[PDB]
Amino acid sequence: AQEAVKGVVELFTSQGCASCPPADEALRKMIQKGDVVGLSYHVDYWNYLGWTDSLASKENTERQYGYMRALGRNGVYTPQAILNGRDHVKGADVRGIYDRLDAFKREGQGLNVPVSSKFAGDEVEIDIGAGNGKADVVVAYFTREQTVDVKKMSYWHSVYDVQTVGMWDGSPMTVKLPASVVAKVKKGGCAVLLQTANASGDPAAIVGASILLGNETQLEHH
Amino acid sequence: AQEAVKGVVELFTSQGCASCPPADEALRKMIQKGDVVGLSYHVDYWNYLGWTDSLASKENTERQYGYMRALGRNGVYTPQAILNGRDHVKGADVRGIYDRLDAFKREGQGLNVPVSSKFAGDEVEIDIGAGNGKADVVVAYFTREQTVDVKKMSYWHSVYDVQTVGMWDGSPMTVKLPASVVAKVKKGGCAVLLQTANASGDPAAIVGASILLGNETQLEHH
């Protein structure tokens, strides 16, 4: 292969948030490089009546709340990037995010558990490697690229649904998802997050991750 | 009469918020003094599964979002107190809130429009005085005092419903509410807020306010 993925970057943003564009660009650049699992969660607290993006959801906002609690904070803001489900940083701080992810890796707090995903014809197969502890197998479904009327703006990896498909206990496992899931991934893609939780059950460190894009086109040079 | 009410204090808090108790006490003290219209809005972003107060609501959280936008901020936190619908301050900063309200009054940004409320037998009557501009006649219904299991903690003026009952255009007006409203106020009380809105329609400066308690007991000394 080559160099393993550096980590997970979950950006909470909104088209109604004026200071978010810079962070949106940051994420787009990281997704283009493909060295991180990047996700964009549009929050609903920026909607009022006009500039209400059809990409936001209450569920996305609730996830940012889960992180707020787990991180011991007393509030939320946008743009906010959550790294490896372990810490937060300004969404536009590209240098900070990569330096943070590197710091995690150097401490063995990176993506230590192998996670693989692929289409098994009319089903989705998720392969998880061996490790220690317990974690949920979380799947975040997103559209690859979606344009919205401002003119027109483009957003990438906008999550529209998140679901837990099983539990990992340290043992290697394979989870098979039905055609209904295949159809959803085909709308863009999905990210598999092997995520632990704290005592309260809120989202915590992500110890493994993978992205499966709906487009399975193999690009080759001869 | 005597000295007019100093202003409106809207506290966003939650029993799931560990740093909120101090702010809750602050509000209780101001409500006891009765020189301000005090309201407590329990937010829902501190609920997870256990310490989920039955006093929180999505609507309350949305109101804090409305204020976030109007105030030009990019996030929310608890405990947060909104003063006269014009600015925010730490919920526990008792000195700051009163000094802020005083600063508003000295600038003629206090409660300049008279607002009165009373029970008309089986109906609720709200009397609004003359002024300039446009504002919604907002009614926030609350329980006077509610205890929740931690032991047991007590919360005051916990808002459980907010509704606009009419529009003020600067002209003196009287709004009559049905028996259904009387029943709700009797569950605790209500606060009438003559509130303006910004260009986006979000909650802005409150130019008049009044509280009507369900208990209409007249205390006299002879």
| Min distance B219 CA to chain A CA atoms (Å) | 42
Q: Exposed/middle/buried for B197, CB within 10 Å: 0-12, 13-18, 19+?
A: middle
Could you say which of B19, B48, B74 has the minimum Cβ distance to residue A17?
A: B74
Experimental method: X-ray
Q: Between chains, do A77 and B78 touch, taking CB under 8 Å as contact?
A: no
Q: What CA–CA distance (Å, rounded) separates B134 from B198? A: 11
For residue A80, the tally of other CB atoms under 10 A from its CB is 24
The first and second tokens of residue A111, run together, are: 């993506």
- Would you put residue B169 in left (φ > 0), alpha (ψ -120 to 50) or beta? alpha
What's the distance, CA A127 to chain centroid?
Answer: 18
Number of H helices, E strands in chain A: 4, 12
The C-alpha angle A39, A127, A2, rounded to 5 degrees, equals 70
| Min distance A62 CA to chain B CA atoms (Å) | 7
Q: Between chains, do B75 and A74 touch, taking CB under 8 Å as contact?
A: no
Angle between helices B21-33 and B94-106 (to 10 degrees): 50
Domain limits, chain B = 1-222
Residue A26 — φ and ψ, nearest 5°?
-55, -50
Q: What CA–CA distance (Å, rounded) separates B144 from B176? A: 22
Q: Between chains, do A45 and B58 touch, taking CB under 8 Å as contact?
A: no
The C-alpha angle A199, A200, A201, rounded to 5 degrees, equals 90
Q: Given the DSSP bridges, would you call strands A37-42 and A8-13 parallel, antiparallel or unpaired? A: parallel
- How far are the Cα atoms of A13, A59, A135, A144 from residue A44, in angstroms, in the given order? 9, 9, 28, 20
Q: What CA–CA distance (Å, rounded) separates A47 from B63? A: 12
The first and second tokens of residue A88, run together, are: 């937060």
The first and second tokens of residue A119, run together, are: 């289409």
> Resolution in A, one decimal?
1.8
Q: Which helix (H) or strand (E) holds A9?
A: strand A8-13
Q: What CA–CA distance (Å, rounded) separates B40 from B196? A: 20
Could you say which of A62, A74, A202 has the minimum Cβ distance to residue B17?
A: A74
Q: Which helix (H) or strand (E) holds B206?
A: strand B203-213
Work out how many CB contacts closer than 8 A connect A with B: 49
| Min distance A84 CA to chain B CA atoms (Å) | 21
DSSP label at residue B35: S
Q: What CA–CA distance (Å, rounded) separates A143 from A157? A: 5
| Min distance A63 CA to chain B CA atoms (Å) | 10
A73, closest residue in chain B (CA to CA): B77
**A197-220 residues labelled b (16+ CB within 10 A) or e (exposed):** beeeebbbbbbbbbbbbbeeeeee
SS (H, E, C) B110-171: CCCCCEEEEECCCCEEEEECCCCCCEEEEEEEEEEEEEEECCEEEEEEEEEEEEEEEEECCC
The four Cα atoms A155, A156, A162, A165 give a dihedral, to 10 degrees, of 170
Q: Between chains, do B45 and A58 touch, taking CB under 8 Å as contact?
A: no
The first and second tokens of residue B98, run together, are: 């009163």
**Which residue in A124, A106, A138 sits closest to A209, CA to CA?**
A138
- Tokens 């709906």, residue? A214
